[PDB]
Amino acid sequence: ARGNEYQPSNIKRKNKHGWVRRLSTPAGVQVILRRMLKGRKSLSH
Amino acid sequence: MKYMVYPQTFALNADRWYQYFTKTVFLSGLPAALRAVACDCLLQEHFYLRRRRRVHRYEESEVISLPFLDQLVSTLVGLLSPHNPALAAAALDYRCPVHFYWVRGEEIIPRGHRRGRIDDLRYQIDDKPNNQIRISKQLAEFVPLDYSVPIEIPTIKCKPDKLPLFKRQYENHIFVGSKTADPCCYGHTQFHLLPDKLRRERLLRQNCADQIEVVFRANAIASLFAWTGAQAMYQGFWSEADVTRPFVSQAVITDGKYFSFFCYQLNTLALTTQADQNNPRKNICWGTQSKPLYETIEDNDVKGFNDDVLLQIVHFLLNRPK
Amino acid sequence: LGQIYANNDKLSKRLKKVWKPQLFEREFYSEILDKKFTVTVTMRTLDLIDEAYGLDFYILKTPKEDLCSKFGMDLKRGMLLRLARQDPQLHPEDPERRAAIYDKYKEFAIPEEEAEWVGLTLEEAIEKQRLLEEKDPVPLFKIYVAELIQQLQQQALS
Amino acid sequence: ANFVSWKSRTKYTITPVKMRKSGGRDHTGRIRVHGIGGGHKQRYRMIDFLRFRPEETKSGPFEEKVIQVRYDPCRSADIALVAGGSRKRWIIATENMQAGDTILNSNHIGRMAVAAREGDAHPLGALPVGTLINNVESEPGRGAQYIRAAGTCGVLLRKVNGTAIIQLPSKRQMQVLETCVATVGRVSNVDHNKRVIGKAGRNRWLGKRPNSGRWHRKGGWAGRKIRPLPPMKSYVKLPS
Amino acid sequence: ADRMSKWTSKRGPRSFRGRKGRGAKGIGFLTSGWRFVQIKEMVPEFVVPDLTGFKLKPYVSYLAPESEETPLTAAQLFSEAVAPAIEKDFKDNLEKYGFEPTQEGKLFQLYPRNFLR
Amino acid sequence: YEWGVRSTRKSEPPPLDRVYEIPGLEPITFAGKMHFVPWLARPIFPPWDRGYKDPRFYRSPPLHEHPLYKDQACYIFHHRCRLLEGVKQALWLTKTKLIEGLPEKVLSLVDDPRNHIENQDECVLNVISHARLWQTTEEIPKRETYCPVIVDNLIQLCKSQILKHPSLARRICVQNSTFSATWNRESLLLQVRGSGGARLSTKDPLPTIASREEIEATKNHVLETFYPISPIIDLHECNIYDVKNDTGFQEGYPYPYPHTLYLLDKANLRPHRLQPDQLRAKMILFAFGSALAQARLLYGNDAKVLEQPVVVQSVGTDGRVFHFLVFQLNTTDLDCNEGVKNLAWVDSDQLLYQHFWCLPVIKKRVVVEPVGPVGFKPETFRKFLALYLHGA
RNA sequence: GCUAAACCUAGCCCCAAACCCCACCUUACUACCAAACCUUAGCCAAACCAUUUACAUAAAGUAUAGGCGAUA
RNA sequence: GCUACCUAAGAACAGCUAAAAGAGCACACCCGUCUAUGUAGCAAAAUAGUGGGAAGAUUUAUAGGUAGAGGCGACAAACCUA
RNA sequence: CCUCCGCAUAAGCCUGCGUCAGCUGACAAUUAACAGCCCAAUAUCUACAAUCAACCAACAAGUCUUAUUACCCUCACUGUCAACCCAACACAGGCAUGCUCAUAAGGAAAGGUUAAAAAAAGUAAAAGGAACUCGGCAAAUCUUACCCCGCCUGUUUACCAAAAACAUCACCUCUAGCAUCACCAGUAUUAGAGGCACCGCCUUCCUUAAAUAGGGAUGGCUCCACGAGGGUUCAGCUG
RNA sequence: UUAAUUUAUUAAUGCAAACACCUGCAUUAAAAAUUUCGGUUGGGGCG
Ligand SMILES: [Mg+2]
Ligand SMILES: [Mg+2]
Ligand SMILES: [Mg+2]
Ligand SMILES: [Mg+2]
Ligand SMILES: [Mg+2]
Ligand SMILES: [Mg+2]
Ligand SMILES: [Mg+2]
Ligand SMILES: [Mg+2]
Ligand SMILES: [Mg+2]
Ligand SMILES: [Mg+2]
Ligand SMILES: [Mg+2]
Ligand SMILES: [Mg+2]
Ligand SMILES: [Mg+2]
Ligand SMILES: [Mg+2]
Ligand SMILES: [Mg+2]
Ligand SMILES: [Mg+2]
Ligand SMILES: [Mg+2]
Ligand SMILES: [Mg+2]
Ligand SMILES: [Mg+2]
Ligand SMILES: [Mg+2]
């Protein structure tokens, strides 16, 4: 019954975790800054 | 999944490819008040009629030639009805769709879980001739059924895809322009208006001069084959019960200025491999080169009006059933 | 922004407390600027103005830290620039009145080069400096022509 | 939330307007009012509650023809498309308003009391005392705000000086300057009370939904309780 | 779910796939009906010269002598193009020698560059 | 009550920096930076002019500055105006007197069976069936498809009478023709910009139906008025308009005389379809507009009683119901309410068939109504043919 | 005798010194349309917890503070 | 991106019986009454049969909203990525 | 021999049974007409559902722009493969839509053998027919009648409870006289909250052979219909 | 929750303060917030 909580949709993916939304708020900008400091290859989703 | 065969097509050598898809041999040749009316329609749509909105060359076809062709067909049918009683009872259709669906050849599925399995090649023509005339009595033959001609149908070694031609899956329709219940089920003549995308000017700019006649010829072959095939299937023939009498129809294809004339006799609906392995008959399409009805239109005058084009239109409209 | 002890006994609960000034909207006339400003103000500010004997005196006397207002420092810069330039725009067609005002506020006058930078934040000062020192690069054609002419002059002289 | 109110149209029109449902949510996206949601899609017909609105470049009392009386999804009272001069507008239809009727809208406070004919709008000063009224303004020219529901009728209780005392349908008195306009008679659809919803589905069509947790305070709904005083603490709840 | 693969026009739904491109420069615009109007002037015209009679070849004979690289500089170009005329007119208004005060008014403006390659 | 809530109204610009209120100093803004920063003053940018001019980014300068803007407001009637009072308003606007039923002069043209089409009912039934059932692969064609089809097929069926009537060769049905006609009515200047479609043009003007005596007798008839609705209601009140009378064709056009205006209300949705009364009003107005354009072109732009009345017919149909109209414009002195009045014969709500069954209704596995038209009325087609044959 | 066992530098730790072409904020990496600032809290210690505690050297753990207690 | 509720604009509902139905029987579809199996399973809640609804307060695709003492809730302390 | 299967579109995925030579590597491939990517503005416009739309039937009241001014250049760009996606898996699960209603499409339940027990699924069964059992659970077969609870259709503890619990029309009580972000573009026949429960009327015997079972001799009643609710029962049916 | 401690915050009032709005200070509420659940004995009690 459970396990399939991920129902992929690129629109939701980008609107929820994308670069633009991350930069839309100071908290998201700090998310990006933390990923950059850690050296993540993928800063945003 | 079936190939969308477009009568009015930009593809090169589409006439040859459609000849193959149809099993059609193309043959060059053939099997005053009216002039005033023609000039009147031309000048009506070009000069006399006042346009509130500026007419752009991207829409001149639809806003000038289409009303012009409608007026030609309607007025000429009216004037020739006395000289062709059948033309009085004929139904005149404006942009009524013509659908034909047939199977021609087989292919081995190249890839996927169905790889290696035999699949028929299906084709669909969805045409919307600008005008057409439907009668209740079939026209006479242009040549006896089983008429053999030395010319051979072109052979296409490549897949239909290589000619820009794509597959879709949608309703398979067989339609002569009206449902089967319509008594006026046979086809008399079609009038086709080449769209702006296929302008003679654009064709000359991009490719050779022969490609214009190729466009005309392909439109004729496809549209008339679809119409005659739909007529036959309305009469109850199909690939496994081939036509006992040839099914005939005529077409005039124009860009607004240039006109070309085509006669088509469908002798075969047996196009599938099974029904065509030992089928000697072949469909026939007679065609003429495109000729300008007029040379130019300056203000209120039509210069170089060709009477032969109008005579050919009149001859088609005067063709009668027996 | 601080805290208090409920009922002012340390053995009671500790509560967050914000004390805010009572703000008024008042209209002030600046003699040096010959303009009336509507300014949100406090009774303390009104008292300080009274002690200074006028808005202009208050602005010109109170240092940046005591004034603590970007608007106040902009007024200070405007008044100081007006004094340094002795701008005739102060009451035009009334030179006697203009001279009277400038004499009244004479003690605060400073060089214009300094009055230009009064009350500017660090970023504003940086932008001002960048605008001052921005110059579209001179084409090297001009530099090389000047150098060639100079060298040819030297050769002709020698 | 990215909520922008649908009530953005600035120019009055007859055409029904496509109105977006709220679901009882604020612009913040949180539920502010419970029990709202779903229901039949509805279109809003802008109602002109200022009955005395003389046309552009026009003035004085004017008449209007009742083009039709229509059901309004957004009201209990039914509305009337009514046309005058070269304009049409929606108004609240009175009880006996019929298509083809004539309606008079005047701002004239006659010295005598004007014969009060149902449907016409006069300043309260011009009405006989005790006439049934609806679509009453609070201020002159404000626009009708009171006595607007189906079948409702206030009463012009008194007129003294420039002030009239009205009895609102809640049987509460209200003071309004006699220059403020009101329309005579009771609002249409007088049988709105007697309508029986019959089933839960009909309310759900009307956009009312069953909703719980309507209070959001700790412990949910809590009826007020009288806090006893120290002397009465001994007898608050005497054990049996 | 694939965060590392590059975002291309093959990935999103129909709208995404239509909207994103592959870097090809625009050629025209879209009018009503999604009819594309191609602007001729937006199309790069290849100015290909006539190569007939051209003696140069893709390669150079190894017999050619080695030389020292001397990258052209503004000073060198000025000396080789303007200094002669300047001297000849000084011994005997810089536009006469070639300098132009401003690039505006030219078809090929040097800054901001407004020509391809 | 003011429409448009604040939260939806455009937000007020932020208050100007106080630095801009200090006379002597030049504020330091981020204009030099070429980008916003929150710690510098917001520049006051000069309005930009080089835009709002390029095609594809145009603005259409205000109405007052348009060449044809006029202080006197005209009231235009275009194809998409729906008169409140319908036929009464149209009659008042055109200064016309209504007559129920078509004139005998036209109704008699079909009485003799020679004009009757051979297999007339068969052909009409086939036309209806093609329009309403057989038209497309779809089971039930829409009005937008079967209204123009039915009209065109009927017109062809009538044109088939060229056998009996060679005079039918001197006509042609034009499409997308647009006429314009302006005239005054009690100081109100009214225009009709008729676009419609399917204008039947003839090389000869139509014979007049009303005699001199009847035209003069119209004087006694009083033009019905309606209050408090003004005659202008539902007419586009517009200040940008042209007073020129346009017949829709360049000078020298063969077939210059309008014969019939074929108006079709082919909208699929009832709210987008004209009511029968409003359709009849539109027919009256368009016939009047064509006739008035013809009169202004022929007898000049002078308000006068016409010695030779101009006759224009019109058939307005929704694909099933037809309305027949013959309009005789016998006066261009429209300003006054008194004098000879134009006159129109109208036959209303002539339904060619009352219902068409696209599918066979089956109850308890029994076919009750067979597929096809039911209640077909050849009388309406006789009236249609009579109008077509008028003038031939 | 299989699996395995072993290995030594890849680097790292702590100090010192020294102050260190094109594309991309729209769905990022997509050529081109009319707006920041604002007390940390709490764990924890007090054997619970509630005020409180808990974010060079020497003078000196001194003066002081503190449910005058933990402690500071 | 589950789920709860809501917003926008979509879509689906055979046949029979009955007539404009929160109507009957019953497909698709939704659910999950009872039984058996399974219980590191095919499955971190399934399978088979049986059963309830199946034109509605229905089911459902798409996009958007409500966020943690908060949301949402036809209150089961239900749900808010097992 | 088998399949609510199959083919497409959408969404998702992203080369993931094409060729070649040794799972790896190399090589190839999806070609726009389908689809996406639009629109020059200012204003003024736009009461009249849909349901074959014609009657008929309503209520829940239901996607509805021309004039003027600018403007002529034209078919670019992108998706196009597959045996595929979400479930850690070559997962019996989840998975929208259009057509095919048994397939013209798609597939293979048995690796070989033997024929033990126990276990699962199924079929048949003498005589009997509920004696089983907490209970007719399951199965087999047709049915009767009656009680308790809840009026009803609905909702709920995703994953042990589907119910008498929750909601529900109806009714009662309390609060509110009012506009530009919910309530509401509403106004006391309205809105919010709570309670209650459709509605309507008044104030020892029987059953069995045996019966801890069942049925009967504001409040008090009235159960029309409905129910995978909880009990009892005739008849039938049955491993 | 009628356990203890608070009212910071809102809502009311009152007093000052500025001449509807707002600041400070009190009081009363609402809403909450923080924190605690002594020990020994007693199975059919009411300590
Ligand atoms: Mg989902
Ligand atoms: Mg502790
Ligand atoms: Mg059904
Ligand atoms: Mg039902
Ligand atoms: Mg629920
Ligand atoms: Mg509970
Ligand atoms: Mg509980
Ligand atoms: Mg197997
Ligand atoms: Mg085995
Ligand atoms: Mg047995
Ligand atoms: Mg027993
Ligand atoms: Mg029994
Ligand atoms: Mg026993
Ligand atoms: Mg059972
Ligand atoms: Mg129940
Ligand atoms: Mg459960
Ligand atoms: Mg559930
Ligand atoms: Mg359960
Ligand atoms: Mg028992
Ligand atoms: Mg139920």
Side-chain angles (χ1 to χ4, degrees), chain F residues 32 100 125 161 170 186 203 217 264 272 299 347 359 389:
Chain F
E100 289 293 334
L125 264 291
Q161 296 297 93
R170 319 191 61 188
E186 286 77 16
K203 285 222 195 70
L264 57 88
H272 295 58
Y299 319 112
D347 196 355
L359 279 299
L389 291 181

Side-chain angles (χ1 to χ4, degrees), chain F residues 36 38-39 48 52 57:
Chain F
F36 175 92
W39 40 76
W48 186 54
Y52 290 168
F57 286 103

Side-chain angles (χ1 to χ4, degrees), chain D residues 58-98:
Chain D
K58 211 174 303 304
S59 191
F62 61 98
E63 277 194 327
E64 270 177 318
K65 179 67 69 65
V66 179
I67 308 311
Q68 69 161 342
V69 171
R70 181 182 173 85
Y71 165 95
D72 194 6
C74 299
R75 286 168 182 74
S76 44
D78 54 53
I79 57 174
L81 179 69
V82 72
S86 64
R87 77 175 182 180
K88 307 141 92 169
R89 58 177 188 170
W90 292 110
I91 60 167
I92 303 297
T94 60
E95 187 186 12
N96 305 291
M97 206 173 280
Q98 308 279 322

Side-chain angles (χ1 to χ4, degrees), chain C residues 18-154:
Chain C
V18 177
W19 291 281
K20 295 177 183 179
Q22 197 174 24
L23 300 173
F24 320 118
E25 270 275 356
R26 297 285 190 270
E27 213 171 10
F28 299 98
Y29 173 74
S30 167
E31 294 175 354
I32 300 168
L33 302 177
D34 192 20
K35 193 158 186 174
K36 292 177 73 176
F37 299 87
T38 176
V39 183
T40 180
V41 69
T42 57
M43 216 65 181
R44 168 168 173 84
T45 304
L46 292 174
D47 294 358
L48 291 174
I49 283 162
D50 291 352
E51 292 166 20
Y53 309 124
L55 175 84
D56 312 76
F57 270 124
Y58 166 67
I59 295 291
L60 291 170
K61 283 168 182 168
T62 314
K64 179 192 171 307
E65 293 83 0
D66 290 348
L67 199 60
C68 191
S69 170
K70 190 55 177 71
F71 178 47
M73 286 314 280
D74 287 344
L75 281 181
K76 199 170 190 169
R77 181 166 70 263
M79 291 178 199
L80 285 174
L81 275 179
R82 186 69 66 89
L83 289 169
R85 299 159 172 167
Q86 302 280 311
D87 197 2
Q89 307 173 5
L90 193 159
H91 282 118
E93 67 178 0
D94 203 357
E96 58 91 19
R97 199 176 171 187
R98 178 170 60 247
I101 301 291
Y102 287 156
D103 195 44
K104 184 179 169 188
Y105 301 103
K106 168 177 50 61
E107 63 266 41
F108 303 109
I110 59 169
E112 186 187 355
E113 295 82 25
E114 301 191 0
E116 282 178 8
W117 301 82
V118 170
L120 289 190
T121 58
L122 194 145
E123 46 264 15
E124 285 177 1
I126 279 176
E127 177 67 1
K128 190 173 192 293
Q129 181 68 18
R130 190 189 63 76
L131 293 174
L132 280 179
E133 76 188 25
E134 62 166 8
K135 304 293 154 53
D136 47 352
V138 290
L140 277 183
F141 206 110
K142 289 179 169 176
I143 298 185
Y144 287 152
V145 162
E147 189 274 331
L148 188 67
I149 290 171
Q150 182 264 349
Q151 185 263 6
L152 289 177
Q153 292 285 338
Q154 301 327 111

